[PDB]
Amino acid sequence: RVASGAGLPTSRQTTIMVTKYSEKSPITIPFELSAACLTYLRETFEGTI
Amino acid sequence: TVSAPATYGNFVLSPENAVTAISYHSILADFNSYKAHLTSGQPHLPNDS
């Protein structure tokens, strides 16, 4: 604050306070596997070419 | 006293058969044998698998 002259009202000092806030925004992607695909992944039948 | 066979037979697929089973949905027994007979020109097969 600047200092004032004669006959003019002076300036009171002013502390200021403020606050920011965070914002949420999540994401998601689906990926799918056919059961026919999984069944050859784990089960294995008569081992043939 | 008949001399009957003691065990079931087995008919393994050829690694060449795996290709024509996929691309052509078809299996011609002993695909490795017909390639050699057409290469040799010989018309007769000793046995038909």
Coordinates of all heavy atoms in Angstrom, one line a residue:
Chain A
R1 N 0.8 -1.2 0.0 CA 0.0 0.0 0.0 C 0.9 1.2 0.0 O 1.8 1.3 0.8 CB -0.9 0.0 1.2 CG -0.2 0.1 2.5 CD -1.2 0.0 3.6 NE -0.6 0.2 5.0 CZ 0.0 -0.8 5.6 NH1 0.0 -2.0 5.1 NH2 0.5 -0.6 6.8
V2 N 0.5 2.2 -0.9 CA 1.3 3.4 -1.0 C 0.9 4.4 0.1 O -0.3 4.5 0.5 CB 1.0 4.0 -2.4 CG1 -0.4 4.5 -2.6 CG2 2.0 5.1 -2.7
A3 N 1.8 5.2 0.5 CA 1.6 6.2 1.6 C 0.9 7.5 1.1 O 1.3 8.0 0.0 CB 3.0 6.6 2.2
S4 N 0.0 8.0 1.9 CA -0.9 9.0 1.4 C -0.5 10.4 1.8 O 0.4 10.6 2.7 CB -2.3 8.8 2.0 OG -3.0 10.0 2.1
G5 N -1.1 11.4 1.2 CA -0.8 12.8 1.4 C -1.7 13.5 2.3 O -2.7 13.0 2.9
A6 N -1.5 14.8 2.5 CA -2.2 15.6 3.4 C -3.7 15.8 3.1 O -4.0 16.3 2.0 CB -1.6 17.0 3.6
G7 N -4.6 15.5 4.0 CA -6.0 15.7 3.8 C -6.7 14.6 3.1 O -7.9 14.7 2.8
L8 N -6.0 13.5 2.7 CA -6.6 12.4 2.0 C -6.6 11.2 2.8 O -5.6 10.9 3.5 CB -5.8 12.1 0.7 CG -6.1 13.0 -0.6 CD1 -5.5 14.4 -0.4 CD2 -5.5 12.4 -1.8
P9 N -7.7 10.4 2.8 CA -7.8 9.2 3.7 C -6.7 8.2 3.4 O -6.5 7.9 2.2 CB -9.2 8.7 3.5 CG -9.9 9.9 2.8 CD -8.9 10.6 2.0
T10 N -6.1 7.7 4.4 CA -5.0 6.7 4.2 C -5.6 5.3 3.9 O -6.8 5.1 4.0 CB -4.2 6.6 5.5 OG1 -5.0 6.1 6.6 CG2 -3.6 8.0 5.8
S11 N -4.7 4.4 3.5 CA -5.2 3.0 3.1 C -4.9 2.0 4.2 O -3.7 1.9 4.6 CB -4.4 2.7 1.8 OG -4.9 3.4 0.7
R12 N -5.9 1.3 4.6 CA -5.7 0.2 5.5 C -5.2 -1.0 4.8 O -5.6 -1.3 3.7 CB -7.0 -0.2 6.2 CG -7.3 0.8 7.3 CD -8.6 0.4 8.0 NE -9.7 0.3 7.0 CZ -10.3 1.4 6.5 NH1 -10.0 2.6 6.9 NH2 -11.3 1.2 5.6
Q13 N -4.2 -1.8 5.4 CA -3.7 -2.9 4.8 C -4.7 -4.1 4.8 O -5.5 -4.2 5.7 CB -2.4 -3.4 5.5 CG -2.5 -3.7 6.9 CD -2.6 -2.4 7.8 OE1 -3.6 -1.8 7.8 NE2 -1.4 -2.1 8.4
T14 N -4.6 -4.9 3.8 CA -5.6 -6.0 3.5 C -4.9 -7.3 3.3 O -4.3 -7.5 2.3 CB -6.5 -5.6 2.3 OG1 -6.8 -4.2 2.4 CG2 -7.7 -6.4 2.3
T15 N -5.0 -8.2 4.3 CA -4.6 -9.6 4.0 C -5.7 -10.3 3.2 O -6.9 -10.0 3.5 CB -4.3 -10.3 5.3 OG1 -3.1 -9.9 5.9 CG2 -4.2 -11.8 5.1
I16 N -5.3 -11.1 2.2 CA -6.3 -11.8 1.4 C -6.0 -13.3 1.5 O -4.8 -13.7 1.6 CB -6.3 -11.4 0.0 CG1 -6.6 -9.9 -0.1 CG2 -7.2 -12.1 -0.9 CD1 -6.4 -9.3 -1.5
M17 N -7.0 -14.1 1.6 CA -6.9 -15.5 1.7 C -7.8 -16.2 0.6 O -8.9 -15.7 0.4 CB -7.2 -16.1 3.0 CG -6.2 -15.8 4.1 SD -6.7 -16.8 5.5 CE -5.7 -16.1 6.7
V18 N -7.3 -17.3 0.0 CA -8.0 -18.0 -1.0 C -7.6 -19.4 -1.0 O -6.7 -19.8 -0.3 CB -7.7 -17.4 -2.4 CG1 -8.5 -16.1 -2.7 CG2 -6.2 -17.1 -2.5
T19 N -8.4 -20.2 -1.8 CA -8.2 -21.7 -1.7 C -8.6 -22.3 -3.0 O -9.7 -22.0 -3.5 CB -9.0 -22.3 -0.6 OG1 -8.4 -21.9 0.7 CG2 -9.1 -23.8 -0.7
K20 N -7.8 -23.2 -3.6 CA -8.2 -24.0 -4.7 C -8.7 -25.4 -4.3 O -8.4 -25.8 -3.2 CB -7.0 -24.2 -5.7 CG -6.3 -22.9 -6.1 CD -7.2 -22.0 -6.9 CE -6.9 -22.1 -8.4 NZ -7.7 -21.0 -9.1
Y21 N -9.4 -26.0 -5.2 CA -10.0 -27.4 -4.9 C -9.7 -28.3 -6.1 O -9.8 -27.9 -7.2 CB -11.4 -27.3 -4.6 CG -11.8 -26.8 -3.3 CD1 -12.4 -25.5 -3.1 CD2 -11.7 -27.5 -2.1 CE1 -12.8 -25.0 -1.9 CE2 -12.1 -27.1 -0.9 CZ -12.6 -25.8 -0.8 OH -13.0 -25.3 0.4
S22 N -9.4 -29.6 -5.8 CA -9.2 -30.6 -6.8 C -10.5 -31.1 -7.3 O -11.5 -31.1 -6.7 CB -8.3 -31.7 -6.2 OG -8.7 -32.0 -4.9
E23 N -10.4 -31.7 -8.6 CA -11.6 -32.2 -9.3 C -11.3 -33.6 -9.8 O -10.2 -33.8 -10.5 CB -12.0 -31.3 -10.4 CG -13.4 -31.7 -10.9 CD -13.6 -31.1 -12.3 OE1 -12.6 -30.9 -13.0 OE2 -14.8 -31.0 -12.7
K24 N -12.2 -34.5 -9.7 CA -12.0 -35.9 -10.0 C -12.6 -36.2 -11.4 O -13.7 -35.6 -11.8 CB -12.7 -36.8 -9.0 CG -12.4 -36.5 -7.6 CD -13.3 -37.1 -6.6 CE -14.6 -36.3 -6.6 NZ -14.3 -34.9 -6.3
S25 N -12.0 -37.1 -12.2 CA -12.5 -37.4 -13.5 C -12.0 -38.8 -14.0 O -11.3 -38.8 -15.0 CB -12.2 -36.3 -14.5 OG -10.8 -36.1 -14.4
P26 N -12.5 -39.9 -13.5 CA -11.8 -41.2 -13.8 C -12.2 -41.7 -15.2 O -13.1 -41.2 -15.8 CB -12.4 -42.1 -12.7 CG -13.6 -41.5 -12.3 CD -13.5 -40.1 -12.4
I27 N -11.5 -42.8 -15.6 CA -11.6 -43.3 -17.0 C -11.7 -44.9 -16.9 O -11.3 -45.5 -15.9 CB -10.4 -42.9 -17.8 CG1 -9.2 -43.8 -17.6 CG2 -10.1 -41.5 -17.6 CD1 -8.0 -43.2 -18.2
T28 N -12.2 -45.5 -18.0 CA -12.5 -46.9 -18.0 C -12.6 -47.4 -19.4 O -13.2 -46.7 -20.3 CB -13.7 -47.2 -17.2 OG1 -13.5 -47.1 -15.8 CG2 -14.2 -48.6 -17.6
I29 N -12.0 -48.6 -19.7 CA -12.0 -49.2 -21.0 C -12.4 -50.7 -20.9 O -11.8 -51.4 -20.1 CB -10.7 -49.1 -21.8 CG1 -10.3 -47.7 -22.0 CG2 -10.8 -49.9 -23.1 CD1 -11.1 -47.0 -23.1
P30 N -13.4 -51.2 -21.5 CA -13.7 -52.7 -21.5 C -13.0 -53.5 -22.5 O -13.0 -53.1 -23.7 CB -15.2 -52.7 -21.7 CG -15.5 -51.6 -22.7 CD -14.4 -50.5 -22.4
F31 N -12.4 -54.6 -22.2 CA -11.9 -55.6 -23.2 C -12.4 -57.0 -22.9 O -12.4 -57.4 -21.7 CB -10.4 -55.5 -23.3 CG -9.7 -56.4 -22.3 CD1 -9.4 -57.7 -22.6 CD2 -9.3 -55.9 -21.0 CE1 -8.7 -58.5 -21.7 CE2 -8.6 -56.7 -20.1 CZ -8.3 -58.0 -20.5
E32 N -12.8 -57.7 -23.9 CA -13.5 -58.9 -23.7 C -12.8 -60.1 -24.4 O -12.2 -60.0 -25.4 CB -14.9 -58.8 -24.2 CG -15.1 -58.2 -25.5 CD -16.5 -58.1 -25.9 OE1 -17.3 -59.0 -25.5 OE2 -16.9 -57.1 -26.6
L33 N -13.0 -61.3 -23.8 CA -12.4 -62.5 -24.3 C -13.5 -63.6 -24.4 O -14.2 -63.9 -23.5 CB -11.4 -63.0 -23.3 CG -10.1 -62.2 -23.3 CD1 -9.0 -63.0 -22.6 CD2 -9.7 -62.0 -24.7
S34 N -13.6 -64.1 -25.6 CA -14.6 -65.2 -25.8 C -14.3 -66.4 -25.0 O -13.1 -66.7 -24.8 CB -14.7 -65.6 -27.3 OG -13.5 -66.0 -27.8
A35 N -15.3 -67.1 -24.5 CA -15.0 -68.3 -23.7 C -14.3 -69.4 -24.5 O -13.5 -70.1 -23.9 CB -16.3 -68.8 -23.1
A36 N -14.6 -69.4 -25.8 CA -13.9 -70.4 -26.6 C -12.4 -70.0 -26.6 O -11.6 -71.0 -26.8 CB -14.5 -70.3 -28.0
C37 N -12.0 -68.8 -26.5 CA -10.6 -68.4 -26.4 C -10.0 -68.9 -25.1 O -9.0 -69.4 -25.0 CB -10.5 -66.9 -26.6 SG -8.8 -66.4 -26.6
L38 N -10.8 -68.6 -24.0 CA -10.2 -69.0 -22.6 C -10.1 -70.5 -22.5 O -9.1 -71.0 -21.9 CB -11.1 -68.4 -21.5 CG -11.1 -67.0 -21.1 CD1 -12.2 -66.2 -21.9 CD2 -11.3 -66.8 -19.7
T39 N -11.0 -71.2 -23.1 CA -11.0 -72.7 -22.8 C -9.8 -73.4 -23.5 O -9.4 -74.4 -23.0 CB -12.3 -73.3 -23.3 OG1 -12.4 -74.7 -22.9 CG2 -12.4 -73.3 -24.8
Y40 N -9.3 -72.8 -24.6 CA -8.0 -73.3 -25.1 C -6.8 -72.7 -24.3 O -5.7 -73.2 -24.5 CB -7.9 -73.0 -26.6 CG -8.8 -73.9 -27.4 CD1 -10.2 -73.6 -27.5 CD2 -8.4 -75.0 -28.0 CE1 -11.0 -74.4 -28.2 CE2 -9.2 -75.8 -28.7 CZ -10.5 -75.5 -28.8 OH -11.3 -76.4 -29.5
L41 N -7.0 -71.7 -23.6 CA -5.9 -71.1 -22.8 C -5.5 -72.0 -21.6 O -4.3 -72.2 -21.4 CB -6.3 -69.7 -22.3 CG -5.2 -68.7 -22.0 CD1 -4.4 -68.5 -23.3 CD2 -5.8 -67.4 -21.6
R42 N -6.5 -72.6 -21.0 CA -6.3 -73.4 -19.7 C -6.4 -74.9 -19.9 O -5.5 -75.6 -19.7 CB -7.2 -72.9 -18.6 CG -7.5 -71.4 -18.7 CD -8.5 -71.0 -17.6 NE -9.8 -71.6 -17.9 CZ -10.9 -70.9 -17.7 NH1 -10.9 -69.6 -17.3 NH2 -12.1 -71.5 -18.0
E43 N -7.6 -75.3 -20.4 CA -7.8 -76.7 -20.8 C -7.0 -77.0 -22.0 O -6.8 -76.1 -22.9 CB -9.3 -77.0 -21.0 CG -10.1 -76.7 -19.8 CD -11.6 -76.8 -20.0 OE1 -12.0 -77.7 -20.9 OE2 -12.4 -76.1 -19.4
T44 N -6.5 -78.2 -22.1 CA -5.8 -78.6 -23.3 C -6.1 -80.1 -23.5 O -5.8 -80.9 -22.7 CB -4.3 -78.4 -23.2 OG1 -3.8 -79.1 -22.1 CG2 -4.0 -76.9 -23.0
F45 N -6.6 -80.4 -24.7 CA -7.1 -81.7 -25.0 C -5.9 -82.6 -25.6 O -4.8 -82.3 -25.5 CB -8.2 -81.6 -26.0 CG -9.0 -80.4 -25.8 CD1 -8.7 -79.2 -26.5 CD2 -10.0 -80.3 -24.9 CE1 -9.4 -78.1 -26.3 CE2 -10.8 -79.2 -24.7 CZ -10.5 -78.1 -25.4
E46 N -6.3 -83.7 -26.2 CA -5.3 -84.6 -26.8 C -4.4 -83.8 -27.7 O -4.8 -83.2 -28.7 CB -6.0 -85.7 -27.6 CG -6.3 -87.0 -26.9 CD -7.7 -87.0 -26.2 OE1 -8.7 -86.4 -26.7 OE2 -7.8 -87.6 -25.1
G47 N -3.1 -83.7 -27.4 CA -2.2 -82.8 -28.0 C -1.9 -83.2 -29.4 O -1.1 -84.0 -29.7
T48 N -2.5 -82.4 -30.4 CA -2.5 -82.8 -31.8 C -2.2 -81.5 -32.6 O -2.7 -80.4 -32.2 CB -3.9 -83.3 -32.2 OG1 -4.9 -82.3 -31.9 CG2 -4.2 -84.6 -31.5
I49 N -1.4 -81.7 -33.6 CA -0.9 -80.6 -34.4 C -2.0 -79.5 -34.7 O -1.7 -78.3 -34.8 CB -0.3 -81.1 -35.7 CG1 0.5 -79.9 -36.4 CG2 -1.3 -81.6 -36.7 CD1 1.8 -79.7 -35.7
Chain B
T1 N -8.0 -121.2 -32.5 CA -7.4 -120.1 -31.8 C -7.1 -119.0 -32.8 O -6.1 -119.0 -33.5 CB -6.1 -120.5 -31.1 OG1 -5.2 -120.9 -32.2 CG2 -6.4 -121.7 -30.2
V2 N -8.0 -118.0 -32.9 CA -7.9 -116.9 -33.8 C -6.9 -115.9 -33.3 O -6.8 -115.7 -32.1 CB -9.3 -116.2 -34.0 CG1 -9.2 -115.1 -35.0 CG2 -10.3 -117.3 -34.4
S3 N -6.1 -115.4 -34.2 CA -5.0 -114.4 -33.8 C -5.5 -113.0 -34.1 O -5.1 -112.3 -35.0 CB -3.7 -114.7 -34.5 OG -2.7 -113.9 -34.0
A4 N -6.4 -112.5 -33.2 CA -7.1 -111.2 -33.4 C -6.2 -110.1 -32.9 O -5.5 -110.3 -31.9 CB -8.4 -111.2 -32.7
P5 N -6.3 -108.9 -33.5 CA -5.4 -107.8 -33.1 C -5.7 -107.4 -31.7 O -6.9 -107.4 -31.2 CB -5.7 -106.7 -34.1 CG -7.1 -107.0 -34.4 CD -7.3 -108.4 -34.5
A6 N -4.7 -106.9 -31.0 CA -4.8 -106.6 -29.5 C -5.1 -105.2 -29.2 O -5.5 -104.9 -28.0 CB -3.5 -107.1 -28.8
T7 N -5.0 -104.3 -30.1 CA -5.1 -102.9 -29.8 C -5.7 -102.1 -30.9 O -5.6 -102.4 -32.1 CB -3.7 -102.3 -29.4 OG1 -3.1 -103.2 -28.6 CG2 -3.9 -101.0 -28.7
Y8 N -6.4 -101.0 -30.6 CA -7.0 -100.1 -31.6 C -5.9 -99.5 -32.4 O -4.7 -99.3 -31.9 CB -7.8 -99.0 -30.9 CG -9.0 -99.5 -30.2 CD1 -9.0 -99.6 -28.8 CD2 -10.1 -99.9 -30.9 CE1 -10.1 -100.0 -28.1 CE2 -11.2 -100.3 -30.2 CZ -11.2 -100.4 -28.9 OH -12.3 -100.8 -28.2
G9 N -6.2 -99.1 -33.6 CA -5.3 -98.4 -34.5 C -5.3 -96.9 -34.2 O -6.1 -96.4 -33.4
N10 N -4.3 -96.2 -34.7 CA -4.3 -94.8 -34.5 C -3.9 -94.1 -35.8 O -3.1 -94.6 -36.6 CB -3.3 -94.4 -33.4 CG -1.9 -94.7 -33.8 OD1 -1.6 -95.6 -34.5 ND2 -1.0 -93.8 -33.3
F11 N -4.5 -92.9 -36.0 CA -4.4 -92.2 -37.3 C -4.0 -90.7 -37.0 O -4.8 -89.9 -36.9 CB -5.7 -92.3 -38.1 CG -5.7 -91.6 -39.4 CD1 -4.7 -91.9 -40.3 CD2 -6.6 -90.7 -39.7 CE1 -4.7 -91.2 -41.6 CE2 -6.7 -90.0 -40.9 CZ -5.7 -90.3 -41.8
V12 N -2.7 -90.5 -36.9 CA -2.2 -89.1 -36.6 C -2.3 -88.2 -37.8 O -2.2 -88.7 -39.0 CB -0.7 -89.2 -36.1 CG1 0.1 -89.9 -37.2 CG2 -0.1 -87.8 -35.9
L13 N -2.6 -87.0 -37.6 CA -2.7 -86.0 -38.6 C -1.3 -85.5 -39.0 O -0.4 -85.4 -38.1 CB -3.5 -84.8 -38.2 CG -5.0 -84.9 -38.3 CD1 -5.6 -83.5 -38.2 CD2 -5.4 -85.6 -39.5
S14 N -1.1 -85.2 -40.3 CA 0.2 -84.7 -40.8 C 0.3 -83.2 -40.5 O -0.7 -82.5 -40.4 CB 0.3 -84.9 -42.3 OG 1.5 -84.4 -42.8
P15 N 1.5 -82.7 -40.3 CA 1.7 -81.2 -40.2 C 1.3 -80.5 -41.4 O 0.9 -79.3 -41.3 CB 3.2 -81.0 -39.8 CG 3.8 -82.3 -40.3 CD 2.8 -83.4 -40.1
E16 N 1.4 -81.1 -42.6 CA 0.8 -80.5 -43.8 C -0.7 -80.4 -43.8 O -1.3 -79.5 -44.3 CB 1.3 -81.2 -45.0 CG 2.8 -81.1 -45.2 CD 3.4 -82.1 -46.2 OE1 2.7 -83.1 -46.5 OE2 4.6 -82.0 -46.5
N17 N -1.3 -81.5 -43.2 CA -2.8 -81.5 -43.1 C -3.3 -80.3 -42.3 O -4.4 -79.9 -42.5 CB -3.2 -82.8 -42.4 CG -3.3 -83.9 -43.4 OD1 -2.8 -85.0 -43.1 ND2 -3.8 -83.7 -44.6
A18 N -2.5 -79.9 -41.3 CA -3.0 -78.8 -40.4 C -3.2 -77.5 -41.3 O -4.1 -76.7 -40.9 CB -2.0 -78.5 -39.3
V19 N -2.5 -77.3 -42.4 CA -2.7 -76.1 -43.2 C -4.0 -76.2 -44.0 O -4.8 -75.3 -44.0 CB -1.5 -75.9 -44.1 CG1 -1.7 -74.7 -45.0 CG2 -0.3 -75.6 -43.2
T20 N -4.2 -77.3 -44.7 CA -5.4 -77.5 -45.5 C -6.6 -77.7 -44.7 O -7.7 -77.5 -45.2 CB -5.2 -78.6 -46.5 OG1 -5.2 -79.8 -45.8 CG2 -4.0 -78.4 -47.3
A21 N -6.5 -78.1 -43.4 CA -7.6 -78.1 -42.5 C -8.1 -76.7 -42.2 O -9.3 -76.5 -41.9 CB -7.3 -78.9 -41.2
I22 N -7.2 -75.7 -42.1 CA -7.5 -74.4 -41.7 C -8.0 -73.6 -42.9 O -9.0 -73.0 -42.9 CB -6.3 -73.7 -41.1 CG1 -6.1 -74.2 -39.6 CG2 -6.4 -72.2 -41.1 CD1 -4.7 -74.0 -39.1
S23 N -7.1 -73.5 -44.0 CA -7.5 -72.7 -45.1 C -8.6 -73.3 -46.0 O -9.3 -72.6 -46.7 CB -6.2 -72.4 -45.9 OG -5.4 -73.6 -46.1
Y24 N -8.7 -74.7 -46.0 CA -9.6 -75.3 -46.9 C -10.6 -76.2 -46.3 O -11.4 -76.8 -47.0 CB -8.8 -76.1 -48.0 CG -7.8 -75.4 -48.8 CD1 -6.5 -75.6 -48.6 CD2 -8.1 -74.4 -49.7 CE1 -5.5 -74.9 -49.2 CE2 -7.2 -73.7 -50.3 CZ -5.9 -74.0 -50.1 OH -4.9 -73.3 -50.8
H25 N -10.6 -76.4 -45.0 CA -11.5 -77.3 -44.3 C -11.5 -78.7 -44.8 O -12.6 -79.3 -45.0 CB -12.9 -76.7 -44.3 CG -13.0 -75.3 -43.7 ND1 -14.0 -74.4 -44.0 CD2 -12.2 -74.7 -42.8 CE1 -13.8 -73.3 -43.3 NE2 -12.7 -73.5 -42.6
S26 N -10.4 -79.2 -45.2 CA -10.3 -80.5 -45.9 C -8.9 -81.1 -45.6 O -7.9 -80.5 -45.4 CB -10.5 -80.3 -47.4 OG -10.2 -81.4 -48.1
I27 N -9.0 -82.5 -45.6 CA -7.8 -83.3 -45.3 C -7.8 -84.4 -46.3 O -8.7 -85.3 -46.2 CB -7.9 -83.8 -43.9 CG1 -7.9 -82.7 -42.9 CG2 -6.7 -84.8 -43.6 CD1 -6.6 -81.9 -42.9
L28 N -6.7 -84.5 -47.1 CA -6.5 -85.6 -48.0 C -5.4 -86.4 -47.4 O -4.2 -86.0 -47.4 CB -6.1 -85.1 -49.4 CG -4.8 -84.3 -49.4 CD1 -3.7 -85.3 -49.9 CD2 -4.9 -83.1 -50.3
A29 N -5.8 -87.6 -46.8 CA -4.8 -88.5 -46.1 C -3.5 -88.7 -46.8 O -3.4 -88.8 -48.0 CB -5.5 -89.9 -45.9
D30 N -2.4 -88.6 -46.0 CA -1.0 -88.7 -46.6 C -0.8 -87.7 -47.7 O -0.5 -88.0 -48.8 CB -0.8 -90.1 -47.1 CG -0.5 -91.1 -46.0 OD1 -0.1 -90.7 -44.9 OD2 -0.7 -92.3 -46.3
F31 N -1.0 -86.4 -47.3 CA -0.7 -85.3 -48.2 C 0.8 -85.3 -48.6 O 1.2 -84.8 -49.7 CB -1.1 -84.0 -47.6 CG -0.8 -82.8 -48.5 CD1 -1.7 -82.4 -49.5 CD2 0.4 -82.1 -48.4 CE1 -1.5 -81.3 -50.2 CE2 0.6 -81.0 -49.2 CZ -0.3 -80.6 -50.1
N32 N 1.7 -85.8 -47.7 CA 3.1 -85.9 -48.1 C 3.4 -86.9 -49.1 O 4.4 -86.9 -49.8 CB 3.9 -86.1 -46.8 CG 5.3 -85.4 -46.9 OD1 5.5 -84.5 -47.6 ND2 6.2 -86.0 -46.1
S33 N 2.5 -87.9 -49.2 CA 2.7 -89.0 -50.1 C 2.3 -88.7 -51.6 O 2.9 -89.0 -52.5 CB 2.0 -90.3 -49.7 OG 2.2 -91.4 -50.6
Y34 N 1.2 -88.0 -51.7 CA 0.7 -87.5 -53.0 C 1.7 -86.6 -53.7 O 1.9 -86.6 -54.9 CB -0.7 -86.9 -53.0 CG -1.8 -87.9 -52.7 CD1 -2.1 -88.2 -51.4 CD2 -2.5 -88.6 -53.7 CE1 -3.1 -89.1 -51.1 CE2 -3.5 -89.5 -53.4 CZ -3.8 -89.8 -52.1 OH -4.8 -90.7 -51.8
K35 N 2.3 -85.7 -52.9 CA 3.3 -84.8 -53.4 C 4.5 -85.6 -54.0 O 5.0 -85.2 -55.1 CB 3.8 -83.8 -52.4 CG 5.0 -83.0 -52.8 CD 5.4 -82.0 -51.7 CE 5.8 -82.7 -50.5 NZ 7.0 -83.6 -50.7
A36 N 4.9 -86.7 -53.4 CA 6.0 -87.4 -53.9 C 5.6 -88.2 -55.1 O 6.4 -88.5 -56.0 CB 6.6 -88.3 -52.8
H37 N 4.4 -88.7 -55.1 CA 4.0 -89.5 -56.2 C 3.7 -88.7 -57.5 O 4.0 -89.1 -58.6 CB 2.8 -90.4 -55.9 CG 3.2 -91.5 -55.0 ND1 4.0 -92.5 -55.3 CD2 2.8 -91.8 -53.7 CE1 4.2 -93.4 -54.4 NE2 3.4 -93.0 -53.4
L38 N 3.1 -87.5 -57.3 CA 3.0 -86.6 -58.5 C 4.4 -86.1 -58.9 O 4.5 -85.8 -60.1 CB 2.1 -85.4 -58.1 CG 0.6 -85.7 -58.1 CD1 -0.1 -84.4 -57.9 CD2 0.1 -86.3 -59.4
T39 N 5.3 -85.9 -58.0 CA 6.7 -85.6 -58.4 C 7.3 -86.7 -59.2 O 8.0 -86.5 -60.2 CB 7.5 -85.2 -57.2 OG1 7.1 -83.9 -56.7 CG2 9.0 -85.2 -57.5
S40 N 7.1 -88.0 -58.8 CA 7.7 -89.1 -59.4 C 6.9 -89.7 -60.6 O 7.3 -90.5 -61.3 CB 7.9 -90.2 -58.4 OG 6.6 -90.6 -57.8
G41 N 5.6 -89.2 -60.8 CA 4.8 -89.6 -61.9 C 4.2 -91.0 -61.6 O 3.4 -91.4 -62.5
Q42 N 4.4 -91.6 -60.5 CA 3.9 -92.9 -60.3 C 2.4 -92.9 -60.0 O 2.0 -92.2 -59.1 CB 4.7 -93.6 -59.1 CG 6.2 -93.6 -59.4 CD 6.9 -94.4 -58.3 OE1 6.8 -94.2 -57.1 NE2 7.7 -95.4 -58.8
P43 N 1.6 -93.7 -60.7 CA 0.1 -93.6 -60.5 C -0.4 -94.3 -59.3 O -1.5 -94.0 -58.8 CB -0.4 -94.2 -61.8 CG 0.7 -95.1 -62.3 CD 2.0 -94.5 -61.8
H44 N 0.2 -95.4 -58.9 CA -0.3 -96.3 -57.9 C 0.3 -96.0 -56.5 O 1.5 -95.7 -56.3 CB -0.2 -97.7 -58.2 CG -1.0 -98.1 -59.4 ND1 -0.9 -97.6 -60.7 CD2 -2.0 -99.0 -59.5 CE1 -1.7 -98.1 -61.5 NE2 -2.5 -99.0 -60.8
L45 N -0.6 -96.1 -55.5 CA -0.2 -96.0 -54.1 C -0.1 -97.4 -53.5 O -1.0 -98.2 -53.8 CB -1.2 -95.1 -53.3 CG -0.8 -93.7 -52.9 CD1 -0.6 -93.0 -54.2 CD2 -1.9 -93.1 -52.1
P46 N 0.8 -97.7 -52.6 CA 0.8 -99.0 -52.0 C -0.3 -99.3 -51.0 O -0.8 -100.4 -50.9 CB 2.2 -99.1 -51.3 CG 2.6 -97.7 -51.1 CD 2.0 -96.9 -52.3
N47 N -0.8 -98.2 -50.3 CA -1.9 -98.4 -49.4 C -2.6 -97.0 -49.2 O -1.9 -96.0 -49.4 CB -1.4 -98.9 -48.1 CG -2.5 -99.5 -47.2 OD1 -3.7 -99.2 -47.5 ND2 -2.2 -100.2 -46.2
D48 N -3.9 -97.0 -48.9 CA -4.6 -95.8 -48.8 C -5.0 -95.4 -47.4 O -6.1 -95.1 -47.1 CB -5.9 -96.0 -49.6 CG -6.6 -97.3 -49.4 OD1 -6.0 -98.1 -48.6 OD2 -7.7 -97.5 -50.0
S49 N -4.0 -95.5 -46.5 CA -3.9 -94.9 -45.2 C -4.9 -95.6 -44.2 O -4.6 -95.7 -43.0 CB -4.2 -93.4 -45.3 OG -5.6 -93.2 -45.6

